[PDB]
């Protein structure tokens with residue numbers, strides 16, 4: 344999903360990107376006796392203030 | 400048993416076909432002031448005020464980034480801070496083992512009077528520091544200069560943390576002490592544990608500040624290093640002259656400094672579930688100056704009349720040279736040395752098949768001018784054009800004779816002070832045999848500019864950049880300075896190579912040749 348498009352250049356698939364991200368993983372949870380089956384997203388990593396570029 | 404020599408009949412043997420002689424060449428040496436230099440990766444920093452009778456007074460400050468040993472900590476429920484102590488170990492050596500355990504230490508690397516006192520102020524920095532920053536497609540490094548004291552001083556929040564007025568030895572009357580801080584704990588079921596700690600800088604910081612900054616802070620601010628460093632930007636150390644007392648400066652290793660916060664939480668409980676409390680401790684370590692670029696040494700110097708006049712651009716002659724060379728560490732000055740005379744005759748030296756036995760540069764100290772001031776223990780000569788060590792430095796693998804003296808290594812290369820019977824410096828001799836040999840042996844080699852500057856350790860051969868490069872000549876620049884020079888706060892005065900200087904004290908290159916005939 345592209346919420347907003349930048350006003351600059353675009354990095355290559357092998358270039359370094361200076362960005363902040365918040366990741367979460369999707370895991371289907373088994374339907375329990377009292378709770379029905381659903382999807383849950385658990386947080387694992389986040390970088391609010393980037394310091395070094397990440398090689399893509 | 401016929402391996403002994405004798406001195407009978409030497410006149411009967413014929414003469415050899417080589418002539419061992421020495422030649423003297425003039426050198427062009429002038430002074431070059433060192434403007435704001437990079438103080439971001441200095442292994443050792445200075446904190447205090449040093450008053451030099453000849454060079455002047457220098458004030459050294461320090462700014463560093465703080466970090467947590469373990470991020471995303473579990474402080475506990477209902478935390479109550481008990482104490483916040485900052486400890487920075489001092490360079491000290493045990494001098495006399497005493498009875499009843501304990502020890503007696505003597506502070507090392509302390510410059511200035513032993514009775515000096517300074518007004519120490521520890522503030523919370525409000526200026527975010529970074530090690531690198533993206534640019535127009537490149538990741539450039541971040542540099543903090545010695546002249547950025549105003550930027551860090553203006554962006555400081557609140558008042559000094561060391562605000563315990565009950566102890567004036569930690570603020571307004573601070574002095575580098577040498578106590579052993581004896582501690583006894585009867586926690587061994589009743590038995591005591593007499594534990595001793597080497598001399599260190601112990602300061603009691605505002606407990607209320609750390610209560611809400613860490614113990615009562617949102618978990619989103621101490622989850623990682625990036626967020627924490629943005630929250631707690633760092634610590635700023637400011638020094639001022641104490642009321643009615645001299646000032647001294649000391650070189651410290653802030654990489655081992657840390658502030659431990661001792662508090663009491665409600666314990667994991669759930670078994671007894673009472674209002675009981677447990678003792679907990681969190682450590683806020685200071686960032687490492689070598690592994691991080693979030694540390695700067697703010698060095699401000701009040702150059703004296705003589706020193707400022709000699710290094711001024713109006714009193715420097717780049718054609719003939721300077722009669723006196725003022726080389727000082729830190730944000731001081733250096734000397735540009737050019738072997739123009741040798742280069743002019745280099746064509747004839749290589750045509751006569753002459754070989755170089757040894758080449759040396761002897762710098763004579765001006766004892767009359769350099770009186771009453773501490774003298775540097777060693778000087779360093781490098782290549783100013785390529786900003787790399789000379790070939791002689793790498794070719795010398797000698798180690799200091801004294802065991803454990805890594806600072807006196809490479810004695811063949813030179814640079815060590817030659818003290819006289821009066822315990823005062825007399826001269827510095829540097830051997831550049833390999834550099835001269837390459838010039839005559841290799842025709843494509845070019846005579847590069849040489850720079851002389853004080854050095855703290857011969858091992859540290861890295862270089863620090865200047866905020867603004869200086870234009871020595873049309874296409875010649877002075878952009879970097881040895882890193883070991885910034886750490887040394889001392890300086891020395893040497894005789895220049897001007898033709899007006901007496902031949903016995905004038906600086907000149909002496910080359911010993913093996914003239915084959």
Ligand SMILES: *C(=O)CCCCCCCCCCCCCCC
Nearest residue numbers: 400401402403404405406407408
């Ligand atoms: C210092 O030079 C001390 C004298 C060296 C040793 C003397 C003995 C030399 C042995 C020579 C043997 C020659 C051959 C013997 C039979 C063929």
